[PDB]
């Protein structure tokens, strides 16, 4: 009669043995979510950590790329510097060389003059010789003219 | 008689008219020598005068030939100077460039690592998915096992 | 009292039916939940896979850049060699010109020395000619006075008897 | 007194002969002197001509030197041109290398900028994935508590008559 409760008690026992199997499955799925979130955010943090070292390299490459441009800078200035001096020397050389071509032609000009002056001293001596021969002949004349006039009488 | 002196007087007159023609010829030949010596030593002095100007030119050429050697001197020093600096720049460039080849390979080394780390997060999610499917099947089981046990009597 | 039992039977059958209606009611509801937590999982998996592909897809361009960068480094190294060879080949031409220029300056100093020596010799040979004149006009003066002797001698001596 | 004249004749013939002997004597002697002063002249002329030839003979070597000197000046001018051309052609190669090097450094800065921009973007896409998780586990927590409601709800409600 009253043991109709006994059917209820096993039926009610069927829920509390069920609510437990059910709660434990939901709780083992929520636990499975917050677990995955742990494992990932871990591997994400380590991956995001790579960024600072990658930015280091980029900054160095950036710096090394600057050093390069400053070395190219130094080179242009050098070249232009040592070219300008090379040019100034080139002109001094030139100036010098034009000066030498002048003194050489002034010595060729002198060599030719020495010649006209040497030649005319030869000519001057030959003149003296010529006048010495003419003198000799003249004296041989005045001499024999005194001898011719050493006569007396007659005829 | 005594006029035999008259022959002597004309004879003596023949000498003094002769000594004169003769002295005058010697004296006109000595005069002709010391005259030539005058005309020559004149042209010799002017010729010998050329020597100082010729020595001037030689001294200048000597000087200009010295300037040249000092310009060649300046050039060697210049070249060697601007070469040495060119060399130092060459090395700095090199050093820089070797440094860049290092940072580039450290970024390729990082790119490959990023990949292994990206791939395994994909693999980690597929794992989570796989475990989520296995969980779902497991729960469908424990569920229907509670339903199967909702029977009574008989059999 | 035979009906007194059919009363208990109809309420024990009622309680069982009432109990089964909710027994089905929660099971269907629960199978909805586990089938919803799976969809919530597979959706997030799709959600993440989309972003992980988009992120992993950056690898090729990053590699493009490094490759382009790496070869541009080679360009520089080429330019270095070229510059090197240019300066070296300039250094060597400059060496030879230097020598030639040197050799040439010596040859000029030698010709200059020759002309200074030639100038010197030319002066002493001019000196000799100046000397040759003062020698000559000396013998010239001495010849005339020596002849005026022998002239005026035999004039003075030729007048009358002399010994 | 006929002989007194032959006395004067023999002494006037004597005086004339004596006078002629010396007349020849000085003329021969004088023709020796004028013939000696000419030899003294022609000898000095030979004497000078020898020295003037030896002196004038220096002209050719002096000219040799100037010519050798003049062409050595041309050697220098050649070397100048060569050096000029060498430096000019070096200046121009150096100009091009400079440009290439320049152009190259820009291309590298561009690839670097790209990678700094690529790095930035890659971080924010990583940020989103971190965000996507905290979104997910939020919806995860909220889903569980919402289901524990509907679970414990119909357990509590499914015991006996409820409305």
Residue numbers in the entry:
A (entry chain B), B (entry chain B): 648 to 802
C (entry chain A), D (entry chain A): 640 to 802
What's in the article?
Of these, the MT-based motor, Kinesin-5 plays a key role, being essential for the assembly of bipolar spindles in most eukaryotic cells and driving or constraining the rate of spindle elongation. Purified, native Kinesin-5 is a ‘slow’, plus-end-directed, bipolar, homotetrameric motor capable of using pairs of N-terminal motor domains at opposite ends of a central rod to crosslink MTs into bundles. Structure-function analysis of the Drosophila melanogaster Kinesin-5, KLP61F, identified a central bipolar assembly (BASS) domain within the coiled-coil rod that is critical for this motor’s bipolar organization and whose deletion results in disassembled, mostly monomeric, Kinesin-5. Instead of the expected antiparallel arrangement of two side-by-side parallel coiled-coils proposed previously, we find that the BASS domain has a novel four-helix bundle structure, which very likely has important implications for its mechanism of action within the spindle.
The asymmetric unit contains a canonical anti-parallel coiled-coil BASS domain dimer encompassing residues 640–802 of both chains, which represents the basic assembly unit of a Kinesin-5 minifilament. This anti-parallel dimer is associated with a second dimer through a crystallographic dyad axis to form the full tetramer, whose dimer–dimer packing surface extends over a large area (≈7000 Å2) and is stabilized by sequential, alternating hydrophobic and ionic residue interfaces, each occupying three-helical turns. The Kinesin-5 BASS domain is an anti-parallel coiled-coil four-helix bundle that switches polypeptide partners at both ends. Alternating hydrophobic and ionic interfaces specify the assembly of the four BASS monomers to form a rigid central bundle. Each interface occupies approximately three alpha-helical turns on each helix within the bundle, starting at the center with interface A of the BASS tetramer and symmetrically extending toward both ends with paired interfaces B–F. A second striking and unexpected feature revealed by the BASS tetramer structure is the transition from this anti-parallel four-helix central bundle to an asymmetric diamond-shaped four-helix bundle near its ends. This transition promotes a swap in helical organizations, from anti-parallel coiled-coil dimers in the central bundle to parallel coiled-coil dimers at its ends. Near the ends of the bundle, two interfaces mediate these helical swaps: a hydrophobic interface (E) and a di-tyrosine interface (F). Beyond interface F, the N-terminal helices swap organization to form parallel coiled-coils between residues 670–640 stabilized by hydrophobic a and d heptad packing interaction (pCC interface).
